Scaffold this active site. Structure first.
Site, PDB file in Angstrom:
ATOM      1  N   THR A 164      30.526  34.818  62.716  1.00 49.08           N
ATOM      2  CA  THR A 164      29.739  35.385  61.580  1.00 49.08           C
ATOM      3  C   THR A 164      30.437  35.239  60.249  1.00 49.08           C
ATOM      4  O   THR A 164      31.658  35.171  60.179  1.00 49.08           O
ATOM      5  CB  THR A 164      29.547  36.893  61.758  1.00 49.08           C
ATOM      6  OG1 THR A 164      28.785  37.144  62.930  1.00 49.08           O
ATOM      7  CG2 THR A 164      28.810  37.481  60.598  1.00 49.08           C
ATOM      8  N   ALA A 224      25.881  43.622  66.925  1.00 50.52           N
ATOM      9  CA  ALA A 224      24.567  43.526  66.301  1.00 50.52           C
ATOM     10  C   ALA A 224      23.793  44.818  66.493  1.00 50.52           C
ATOM     11  O   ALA A 224      23.267  45.363  65.536  1.00 50.52           O
ATOM     12  CB  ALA A 224      23.781  42.358  66.863  1.00 50.52           C
TER      13      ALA A 224
END
Lengths: 222, 125, 204, 212, 199, 233, 222, 198, 197, 196
Positions: free
Chosen positions: D1, D49
């Protein structure tokens, strides 16, 4: 994998599936687990495929060399002893579980070998992932003094148990019949019940679809 | 354990205990507050009786909740202390989770909320 | 970390009409970090092609080795080594390190000069051979490549079709693997000539 | 990420990527890593997440109740602190998150608070979070400027997530880009990195060593 | 591995070896017709327990030794044979799992029995019992073993003692084999389930 | 978290044209020790369901006591407990599956693999599996532990798919089961020769057979087997 | 020690048409190298025109499905028989999953149906409740073998207009329920070949404005 | 790890190499030169495991110097790397593996080209325009990828490094006590002694 | 991270590193690792990530509560007694706060500055100078040498700077310098110019 | 230890050895492992003495109360309470109890409770480290409806072998006979049982 050996009145017959896995993924959908050691001494192997192929082939050589030295047809107890003394010498670090069989001047013979070096002698045998499914058929069906034709069935039906019920096994069936009178007949893909159904679409691409950045002729000849 | 309903409705629609609580206020020392243009003042009557008080320490009627807010009152002294303490805590807590002091209304809403709670809860007056 | 997942990358190989194709990505990683977009994983010893996925140092070492072995072979035998024979050399060479194996997933591709028939083969780190007739996959995106090759492949493609297929097969697989991408090259191999084409893909 | 958020005259800029991996296997390349907490507050996704998506959605619920009660927008400080104190309550329980809580209010101007699962809460001008953060921080640091135009700054952001996507195997699909103003955040679209990559190399000249 | 149920009993005319037939790997019975009676020399046999790989490799190497010995010193004593087994089991304690019973017939000594447990130690005995299933017949065997038994009696004694071991031990099962060793040569017996269970 | 002590090996079953069959050896093993020989592991409930149970016997005994309480509890204030409001397989199975998954979810599982077999009121064959993990699945054939690896392969040669159920007769089905029991007896070191077998038929009703034995075994050939390779005598 | 999770391996897939949506999944349920059933539905109609699959550890998936369906029942009971927005449904599942964040439901879950405009919709989820709206998504054992194909044959990724130089991406033309089902079967038949936990059968639940409908296709049984 | 950076411009190769040597809690030396001259037109920066690091570099240098004299010739900056990689390849399945990372910066006098090679401890060789070892690339590559140009003047190279070093000084926790910079070109190897506040 | 403190004639000086490092990236080069508990009592702190501030703020709030209730300022001694008392509870707590603090205060009644060091186990001790972690190891050698109880604030700031140079030179972590604060009879103020002195 | 309970024509007999070790040290060599929970319901216990004694102590209490309100408990009800404790506390118990009792209706009954907490009702029951050696002998020798003096000898000979092989067993052989006549305690010293 799934392998078996079945003795019959005038010889011995062995069979195997053709699925080759690595983790849950099928790497080869049609490989032969059947390995010639001498012309009449075939060997079915389960476990680590490099080890079954290597140890089979290594002994095969030493047997051939030996057979030339002695001027005599190699024996199934000769291949048996050379295999176990090698595997055992390795304490198991060679992942080969074999079903050795053949015919030689003393008769037909059928043995099983384990990675660690131990051997068993029997009329019907099976090894591998499918072993139990195959052996269930064998226990239910083997009888003494089977015909060659009967054993080819029994053998092949035992591999099928494996193909269907076992996920470690599938695709097709290989068989090798060693008869005392005759040459060894190796029936490759003696059965192919698993044939892929025609796809629902050609995926052939229109030419030019792929973006190319640069092309060149590579040189081979010197 | 003890949950009897002390604050309840009487036939004509009144909650007698709350009214009788106001009666206690009626007997409190007059408190007063008026707002200026840029200030606010709070005045408080104190009984004229004893010239024998120690005025340094005797609790004073005006109290600070924070550095920027005060609370005056009338009625039962002992009850007031309990409202003040709860208020000063809510003040210090509001800073701790909002990183900014309470608005005078928020503090008020909070205190009035607590008062309301004693009219509608069991075992308490 | 699993040494077969450190550097990353893939190789794929297929067969069509009188030809064979062999592709690979160009990535060389140090895990997370991209390091080189120019690490080709396809080598040749004469007309026989070798692709190697896995541990970078071992890939370089194996190429160096098979170049060396195939040179001494050409001098002794007075002829270029064929694919069938080489696949054996590969296997023997790998099994010779059964207990400290090179962490690799090689792939052989070529046309036998006498038989003229197209040939491919793959193998685990210990030289267990897989000589499928249709296609061979290898790398950190083996899973994905099986998925593509199984849906996309069809026998006897013509070179420029086989090209499009093996390219689309590699490309979409490399794009579902974090450790592959950063470019790709495709060889189209035939009886007479060989054509190396570079593909344009995402770089992330 | 790779997620980033910086502050400037124009306000705040937030830019992230789309990739989600499970081992080396890319699972999705269409992941919203910018969380639309409410019309005026954004949060970033890094770590878990679910942890981020779930708790920042619950943060919008908490901010909503604040405004419904106090008749006044919540401060970026108060919204951040709320998430932070919740998270701390679960310290060492398994939670995983690295997020930037971004807002632009009257009282405090554009504000960014970094908040991680460890409990940590930091106010700042520039933050980067995810595997690709060191790549992003390189572009930003050298090119950051308080006097950036909203147009330059968006580019700068999108450019940083690009630098990162490129090197980081665990970053990139597309860049979701946002610009946060006092009247609210404005979504500046999605920009596929595969397409963006080349465009930028041709225009900027950069990625000199990449062939194409 | 043979896990096992094995025994060797000396009687009046010589000695009888007996064993179950089952070899397990886990709960699956790999082979239910195993010949646990192994011949190292015409009238010197052994019964094997613990790692097959090991017990076989050993029996095999002892046989070889006894064969070469025979070639140059004539025939070997059951004692000399036991010694060779132990030299291997002891000198390799660290890499072996073998518990072997050695039984043989000299014309001078008649029946002899030597047990070789894990350590590699040797103990000469009238009878011996070993394997997974032997823990259950210590009680029975000791109570019923009698010295200088008839051959008929010794076969019963083994057939009973083993039937019990098979009954309780899951690791043991199958048929009951026996080898008889006397001056009259070597006899091989076998009793099927339908027979020994009914005792 | 626990570990099983006295345990029962395989439980097998299949379905046929009218009803279902289910069988289980009468053994309670204690490790290698074949400790308890008279153990009934088929538990009938109502005249339409039998519950087969492998795994831990103490945890089995707890489920027995649980099942009788469903009967006695279903019987309470229910004038139709021997008719429309009788316990049914569907129901019995859902109760156990529930209990089983709640236990694994409490990290304190009932250490079994269970197979619920029977007939619905409308004649339908019911046959479903549950285990310590709360996993459940249905199929023409079902077996636990070992029987999964040996019985199914054989029983699936008989009812390979849904469309073979109407074609299998009670006599063909029962034969198949009895054959499988002998196979497990040849090859499952934790098996017993004695077993119980049960049939739930929509027409004939519940038929329960105890004290059976494996007959027609083939051991004669063992005499020709000698040594482990090179030995001749 | 007692390990509470297991793995029955299966493979599911969800594709969102313009005015429809399909959720497909293999039929075969397993444990290690053994088959528990060749037919154990894993895709379920849950009411309000919604389909769901909770693939991974069967006991957990079924327990999750059971709850969601019961959740739907009670939405009606509490909000005057209101229909459950696919989007609301998704949010509700996130809470069910997240509720067990510290003893996760060990399942990758997928739902499909129609959005509030009759537009086709598929949502995808974590084991702990992270969710995203998706165009098309595969799950489970064989997902690595399916998604790279679908990028190529649905979003025409890596494909360009022939002869364009690779300068213009193939047009994003849009597919129909019959064109989709072709792709699903091809994916699954392809996966069946290279994954040992995919086989037996394929059951596809299809959702359109007219309701829920389903199709079954056999798969190789090896 | 310590900072090992490398950058190949048009005429030369610049190699940066931190000056800090730390043992546990105290920074023992603020002026180290993590580099060895292998040959007049070939320099090698190195970083990794204590001790191994130098033993290796000095060992390599010795063999090159010995080669240089035996054939009265200077090996190609490529050849040298191929040899250096082979030695790290051996070290990998060795009893105790050398854990040393390197960069080879050379100027091939035959092709009149500067070359940069990075080879990790595993013997993973790749030839680059700009390279780095360890975490060093994590901070710097975003910048090099953007600004690097194959036709840069040496001064443009040194400027690009300066910008790389700054980011390393801003965002990296370890205080590596600045870098030593050197240039390898057709004329030889020399150390930019003025990289302080340039 | 660096926490230092030194007590001179008429004040207490606190130095606290400005860096905040998470992972391999220095997220911030500006963090002020302190809280003012009361008008004449300041507290620096160092330790585990969230705990560090969560503890600092909790104390502050509590002291601010005591201040208002009594309309009085607790002596720096009483505050540190209270602070230890909390950290002492933490140690046998389910999950302990891993925070180390320094409490510099000016006792308005007794007119002397006071400096208290308390580690996360609740180990309080009162010193002329102190530090937490390894900060003691490099600095103490110098503070032992120069420190004079009669020093001026300027003299203190110099001996402090010298301690900061040692850390800067021999400590392998770049802590991005310190923020210096002084507590004296007139309250607490910050030396915003320590970059050069 | 070596323990057993055998039913016969007149009732039932329990027998035990007397050796409790801790490691190879014999802590007590005269332990009374025959533990009475009710007039004519007794038990042989094996595993942690701590746990078995605490269970027996509790069961005794449970039957004592039972008796006060519902009269004499059945030999089954006794075993039920034992399993209830052992099974419902399997996670923290290492008890292998054998229960035996004389009833007037059923005469002698025997219930064995192994580690599981499972219950099995048998004609005879052998347990404890030494029992493994006597499985063989006891199976061949036990017969339904023996006399008393025959049953005493069965136990004596069986535990005689158990003791002979198991090091963890030994001392004296105690018996407790349960029939209408009443409870009769027996003891057999080594010199006596050692050479049979």
């Amino acid at each position: 994998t799934t392998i078996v050996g079945v003795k019959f009145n005038n010889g011995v017959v062995i069979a195997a599936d053709t699925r080759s896995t690595q983790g849950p993924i099928v790497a080869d959908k049609n490989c032969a687990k059947l390995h010639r050691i001498s012309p009449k001494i075939w060997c079915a192997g389960a476990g680590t495929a490099a080890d079954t192929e290597a140890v089979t082939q290594l002994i095969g050589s030493n047997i051939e060399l030996h057979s030339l030295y002695t001027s005599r047809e190699p024996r199934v107890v000769s291949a048996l002893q050379m295999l176990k003394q090698h595997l055992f010498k390795y304490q198991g670090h060679i992942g080969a579980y074999l079903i050795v069989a053949g015919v030689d001047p003393t008769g037909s013979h059928l043995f099983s070998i384990h990675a660690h070096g131990s051997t068993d002698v029997g009329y019907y045998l099976s090894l591998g992932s499918g072993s139990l499914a195959a052996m269930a058929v064998l226990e239910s069906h083997w009888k003494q003094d089977l015909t060659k034709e009967e054993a080819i069935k029994l053998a092949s039906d035992a591999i099928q148990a494996g193909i269907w019920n076992d996920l470690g096994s599938g695709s097709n069936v290989d068989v090798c019949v060693m008869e005392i009178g005759k040459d060894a007949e190796y029936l490759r893909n003696y059965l192919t019940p698993n044939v892929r159904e025609e796809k629902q679409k050609s995926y052939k691409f229109p030419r030019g679809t792929t973006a190319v950045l640069k092309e060149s002729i590579v040189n081979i000849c010197d | 354990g003890y949950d009897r309903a002390l604050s309840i409705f009487s036939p004509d629609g009144h909650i007698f205990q709350v009214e009788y609580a106001l009666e206690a206020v009626k007997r409190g020392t007059c408190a007063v507050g008026v707002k200026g243009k840029n200030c606010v003042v709070l005045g408080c009557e104190r009984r004229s009786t004893l010239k024998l008080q120690d005025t340094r320490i005797t609790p004073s009627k005006v109290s600070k909740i924070d550095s920027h807010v005060v609370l005056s009152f009338s009625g039962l002294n002992a009850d007031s202390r309990i409202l003040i303490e709860k208020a000063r805590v809510e003040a210090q807590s509001h800073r701790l989770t909002l990183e900014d002091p309470v608005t005078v209304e928020y503090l008020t809403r909070y205190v009035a909320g607590v008062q309301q709670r004693y009219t509608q809860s069991g075992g308490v007056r | 970390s699993d040494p077969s997942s450190i550097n990353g990358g893939i190789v794929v190989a297929m067969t069509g009409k009188d030809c064979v194709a062999i592709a690979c990505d160009l990535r060389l990683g140090s895990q997370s970090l991209g390091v080189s977009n120019k690490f080709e994983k396809i080598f040749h010893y004469g007309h026989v092609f070798l692709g190697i996925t896995g541990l970078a140092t071992d890939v370089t070492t194996l190429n160096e080795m098979f170049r060396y072995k195939t040179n001494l072979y050409k001098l002794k035998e007075e002829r270029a080594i064929e694919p069938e024979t080489f696949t054996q050399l590969v296997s023997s060479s790998l099994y010779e390190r059964r207990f400290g194996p090179y962490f690799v997933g090689p792939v052989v591709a070529g046309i036998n000069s006498k038989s003229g028939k197209p040939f491919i083969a793959g193998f685990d780190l210990i030289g267990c051979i897989d000589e499928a007739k249709d296609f061979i996959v290898s790398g950190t995106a083996s899973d994905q490549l099986f998925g593509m090759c199984e849906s996309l492949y069809e026998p006897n493609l013509e070179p420029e079709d086989l090209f499009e297929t093996i390219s689309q097969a590699l490309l979409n697989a490399a794009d579902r693997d974090a450790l592959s991408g950063w470019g790709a090259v495709v060889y189209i191999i035939k009886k007479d000539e060989v054509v190396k084409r570079y593909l344009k893909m995402r770089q992330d | 990420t790779t997620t980033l958020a910086f502050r400037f005259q124009g306000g705040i800029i937030v830019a992230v990527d789309s990739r989600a991996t499970a081992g080396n296997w890319v699972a999705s390349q269409t992941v919203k890593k910018v969380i639309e907490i409410n019309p005026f507050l954004l949060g970033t996704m890094a770590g878990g997440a679910a942890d981020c998506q779930f708790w920042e959605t619950w943060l919008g619920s908490q901010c909503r109740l604040h405004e419904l009660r106090e008749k006044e927008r919540i401060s970026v400080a108060a919204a951040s602190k709320i998430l932070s104190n919740l998270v701390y309550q679960y310290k060492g329980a398994g939670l995983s998150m690295g997020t930037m809580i971004c807002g632009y209010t009257r009282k405090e101007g554009p504000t960014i608070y970094y908040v991680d699962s460890d409990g940590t809460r930091l106010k700042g001008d520039i933050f980067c979070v995810g595997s690709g953060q060191t790549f992003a921080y390189g572009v930003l640091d050298s090119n950051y400027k308080w006097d950036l135009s909203v147009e330059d700054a968006l580019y700068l952001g999108k450019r940083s997530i690009l630098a990162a996507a490129h090197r980081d195997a665990y970053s990139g699909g597309s860049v979701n880009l946002y610009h946060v103003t006092e009247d609210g955040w404005i979504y500046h679209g999605n920009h596929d990195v595969g397409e963006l990559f080349w465009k930028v190399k041709e225009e900027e000249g950069s990625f000199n060593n990449v062939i194409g | 591995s043979l896990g096992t149920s094995i025994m060797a009993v000396t009687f009046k005319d010589g000695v009888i070896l007996g064993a179950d037939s089952r070899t397990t790997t886990g709960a699956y019975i790999a082979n239910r017709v195993t010949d646990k009676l192994t011949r190292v020399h015409d009238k010197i046999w052994c019964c094997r327990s613990g790692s097959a790989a090991d017990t076989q490799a050993i029996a095999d190497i002892v046989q070889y030794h006894l064969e070469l010995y025979t070639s140059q010193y004539g025939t070997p004593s059951t004692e000399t044979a036991a010694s060779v087994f132990k030299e291997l089991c002891y000198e390799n304690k660290d890499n072996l799992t073998a518990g072997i019973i050695v039984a043989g017939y000299d014309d001078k000594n008649k029946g002899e029995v030597y047990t070789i447990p894990l350590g590699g130690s040797v103990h000469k005995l009238p009878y011996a019992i070993a394997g997974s299933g032997s823990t259950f017949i210590y009680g029975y065997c000791d109570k019923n073993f009698r010295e200088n038994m008839s051959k008929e009696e010794t076969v019963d004694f083994i057939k009973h003692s083993l039937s019990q071991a098979i009954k309780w031990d899951g690791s043991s099962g199958g048929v009951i084999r026996m080898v008889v060793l006397t001056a009259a040569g070597v006899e091989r017996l076998i009793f099927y389930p339908d027979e020994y269970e009914q005792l | 978290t626990q570990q099983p002590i006295v345990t029962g090996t395989s439980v097998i079953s299949m379905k046929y044209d009218n009803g279902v069959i289910i069988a289980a050896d009468n053994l309670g093993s204690y490790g290698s020790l074949l400790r308890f020989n008279g153990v009934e592991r088929l538990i009938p409930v109502g005249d339409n369901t039998v519950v087969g149970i492998s795994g831990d016997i103490s945890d089995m005994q707890h489920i027995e006591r649980l099942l009788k309480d469903l009967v006695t509890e279903n019987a309470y204030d229910n004038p139709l407990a021997d008719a429309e409001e009788a316990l049914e397989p569907s129901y019995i199975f859902e109760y156990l599956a529930t209990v089983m998954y709640q236990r694994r979810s409490k990290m304190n599982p009932l250490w079994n693999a269970i197979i619920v077999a029977g007939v619905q009121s409308n004649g339908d064959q019911f046959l479903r599996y549950v285990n310590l993990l709360g996993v459940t699945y249905s199929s023409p054939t079902l077996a636990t532990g070992f029987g999964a690896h040996m019985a199914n392969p054989l029983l699936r040669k008989v009812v390979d798919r849904e469309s073979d159920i109407p074609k299998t007769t009670v006599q063909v089905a029962e034969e198949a089961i009895v054959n499988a029991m002998r196979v497990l007896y040849y090859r499952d070191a934790r098996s017993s020769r004695n077993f119980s077998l049960a049939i739930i038929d929509k027409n004939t009703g519940l038929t329960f057979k105890k004290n059976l034995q494996v007959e027609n075994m083939k051991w004669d050939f063992a005499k020709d087997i000698k040594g482990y390779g090179t030995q001749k005598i | 020690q007692f390990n509470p999770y297991g793995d029955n391996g299966g493979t599911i897939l969800g594709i969102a048409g313009e005015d429809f949506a399909v959720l497909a999944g293999d039929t075969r349920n397993i444990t290690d190298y053994s088959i528990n059933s060749r037919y154990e539905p894993k895709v379920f109609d849950c009411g309000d025109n919604i389909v769901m699959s909770a693939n991974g550890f069967a006991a957990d998936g079924d327990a999750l499905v059971k709850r969601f369906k019961n959740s739907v029942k009670w939405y009606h009971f509490d909000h005057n028989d209101k229909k459950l927005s696919i989007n609301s449904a998704a949010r509700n599942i996130q809470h069910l999953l997240y509720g067990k964040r510290f003893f996760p439901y060990y399942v990758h879950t997928i739902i499909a149906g129609l959005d509030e405009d009759g537009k086709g919709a598929v949502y995808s989820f974590d084991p702990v409740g992270s969710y995203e709206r998706e165009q098309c998504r595969a799950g489970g054992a064989a997902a690595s073998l399916i998604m790279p194909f679908l990028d190529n044959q649905v979003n025409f990724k890596n494909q360009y207009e022939p002869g364009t130089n690779g300068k213009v991406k193939k047009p994003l033309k849009y597919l129909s329920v019959e064109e989709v089902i072709k792709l699903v079967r091809d994916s699954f038949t392809s996966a069946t070949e290279r994954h040992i936990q995919v086989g037996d059968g394929l059951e596809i639940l299809i959702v359109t404005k007219d309701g829920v409908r389903k199709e079954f296709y056999e798969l190789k049984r090896d | 790890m310590d900072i090992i950076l490398g950058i190949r411009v048009q005429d030369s190769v610049i190699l940066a190499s931190s000056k800090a040597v730390t043992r546990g809690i105290s920074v023992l030396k603020d002026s180290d030169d993590k580099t060895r001259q292998l040959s007049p037109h070939t320099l090698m920066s190195f970083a990794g495991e204590a001790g191994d690091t130098v033993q290796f570099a000095e060992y390599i240098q010795a063999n090159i110097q010995l080669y240089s004299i035996r054939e009265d010739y200077e090996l190609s900056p490529q050849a040298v790397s191929s040899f250096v990689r082979q030695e790290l390849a051996k070290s990998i399945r060795s009893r105790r593996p050398y854990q040393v990372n390197v960069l080879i910066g050379g100027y091939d006098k035959k092709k009149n080209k500067p070359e940069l090679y990075q080879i990790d401890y595993l013997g993973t060789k790749v030839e680059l325009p700009y390279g780095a070892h360890g975490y060093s690339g994590f901070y710097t590559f975003s910048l090099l990828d953007h600004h690097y140009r194959p036709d840069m003047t040496t001064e443009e190279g040194l400027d690009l490094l300066k910008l790389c070093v700054q980011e390393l000084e801003k965002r990296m926790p370890m205080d590596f006590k600045g870098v030593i910079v050197k240039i390898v070109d057709k004329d030889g190897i020399r150390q930019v002694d003025d990289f302080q506040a340039q």
